Amino acid sequence: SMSYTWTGALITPCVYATTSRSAGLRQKKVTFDRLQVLDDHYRDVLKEMKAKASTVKAKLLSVEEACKLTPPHSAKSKFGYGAKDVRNLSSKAVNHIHSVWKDLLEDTVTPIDTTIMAKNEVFCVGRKPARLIVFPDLGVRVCEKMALYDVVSTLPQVVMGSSYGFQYSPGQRVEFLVNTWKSKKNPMGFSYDTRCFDSTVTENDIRVEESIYQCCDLAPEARQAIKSLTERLYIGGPLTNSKGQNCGYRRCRASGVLTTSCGNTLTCYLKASAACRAAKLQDCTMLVNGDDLVVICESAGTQEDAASLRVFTEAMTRYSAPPGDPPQPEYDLELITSCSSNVSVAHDASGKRVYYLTRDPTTPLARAAWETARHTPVNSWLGNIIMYAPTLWARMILMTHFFSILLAQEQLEKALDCQIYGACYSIEPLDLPQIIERLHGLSAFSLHSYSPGEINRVASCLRKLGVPPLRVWRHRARSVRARLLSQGGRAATCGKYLFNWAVKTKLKLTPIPAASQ
Ligand SMILES: CC(C)(NC(=O)c1ccc2c(C3CCCCC3)c3n(c2c1)CCOc1ccccc1-3)C(=O)O
């Protein structure tokens, strides 16, 4: 069936940014008839998964638990309250959510409304159209957590095991990839890019996902709500623009429901697993985060692997998940990008090899540049500093430049909102040494001798963007550093740890103590 049907009603508004002006380009991209044919490989895998699901027990969250787990900056309800009101258990929001939950149990058919908007996201320049998000009202969102919050995390882990990527901290991901890679005699890996994965998700895919939830041991009321949410919301429904006008109907995954991530993870794992069997990949290990898929297996030979991947892709396509980028076999782990990252090697103080996650700095640099400029309530630069703390480009460029700006504006102690790892943290910049040491270990203040590919990518990327060479940054760093040290206190600690790389004569970096008093 068609992933979308449109009524012509415009999708109205809520280095460049995406806007509603390109919504037409995306709609054309995401709108197509899906054809899905399933075979015994798919059925065999689904049965194995259901058997694992059958061992999971999961519980209803009360209205209050679900409110407390509601993120602070969610789009407000059209029923007179917003995310802060939910977090604060205001009577207004509490009363409405109870009415919404009751209606979910008593009505299991009436399509639930959703809003569609185009995202505003910053990119560097072939310009990409804005992403479309589809989401139900805040009240419904909280009820989703009541029914399914205890499901959507626990369940995929049990079903998929080490393949479920969301269980891993950043160092655990690296560890899993490197160990998997080193366990093959002749490793071959490839990422698989599904073309607009959300649009490829069929009604059958979504009823399958529901059938897998129900394999869980649930409360009766939870089964009812999960069935209802599926029928009224998940499988499809009407789309409303920001103006209150209907602009079409959906028959695929909505991007902004609680089950988007769990569901894409299960369905991607299910389809890919079966496709591995169809292709006869040997000693397969998969890693899955939602729609993002990477496979590492035992090489059968250069042309064999190429043929294998083409048969892999044919299976995924039959299963309704056709490739955006045709997949490509790699024989070097560094060259495999999954979840916008790749493993790379450097050396620590004693010259030990340290693997860490890095990525092409283009988008992080562009967004940070954008945030310097227009002073946005969004601080993506700080999140990138944390996520990619060990990297060449985060240490020498982003840290240097932003601690530079923090000093000048004397903002060293103003906490910034930071959305990372699926949560919104209130981050004080002086905490960065302690944060980094926990996430990445001390080696992250001491890494040197980065790979030639990594260095080339960074230096080349800077040139493309008109950013000063790394040499400029090392010089600026030494200045920012001395300023931090001179101020002493927590500022000094930042100079000592975050910038010991810019200095000839290294200070000794010892384990930073937890807070006292
Ligand atoms: C001319 C010179 C040498 N420039 C700088 O010092 C300088 C510092 C930081 C940055 C940055 C960012 C680096 C990462 C943190 C956010 C800003 C970017 N650019 C500069 C140029 C060049 C133009 O604007 C950009 C557009 C896209 C990506 C990066 C940038 C001067 O001294 O005036």
Swiss-Prot record:
The modification Phosphoserine is found at residue 20. Residues 187-305 form the RdRp catalytic domain. Changing residue 290 to A/C: Almost complete loss of RdRp activity. Binds 2 magnesium ion that constitute a dinuclear catalytic metal center. The chain holds residues 2420 to 2963 of 3010 of the full protein. RNA-dependent RNA polymerase that performs primer-template recognition and RNA synthesis during viral replication. Initiates RNA transcription/replication at a flavin adenine dinucleotide (FAD), resulting in a 5'- FAD cap on viral RNAs. In this way, recognition of viral 5' RNA by host pattern recognition receptors can be bypassed, thereby evading activation of antiviral pathways. Signal peptide: none annotated. It is found in: Host cytoplasm; Host endoplasmic reticulum membrane. Homooligomer. Interacts with non-structural protein 5A. Interacts with host VAPB. Interacts with host PRK2/PKN2. Interacts with host HNRNPA1 and SEPT6; these interactions facilitate the viral replication. Part of the replication complex composed of NS2, NS3, NS4A, NS4B, NS5A and the RNA-directed RNA polymerase embedded in an ER-derived membranous web. Activity is up-regulated by PRK2/PKN2-mediated phosphorylation. It comes from Hepatitis C virus genotype 1b (isolate BK). It catalyses: RNA(n) + a ribonucleoside 5'-triphosphate = RNA(n+1) + diphosphate. Mg(2+) 2 binds at residues 193, 291-292. It comes from the Viruses. Its cofactor is Mg(2+). This is RNA-directed RNA polymerase. It is a single-pass type IV membrane protein. The N-terminus is phosphorylated by host PRK2/PKN2. Changing residue 260 to C: Almost complete loss of RdRp activity.
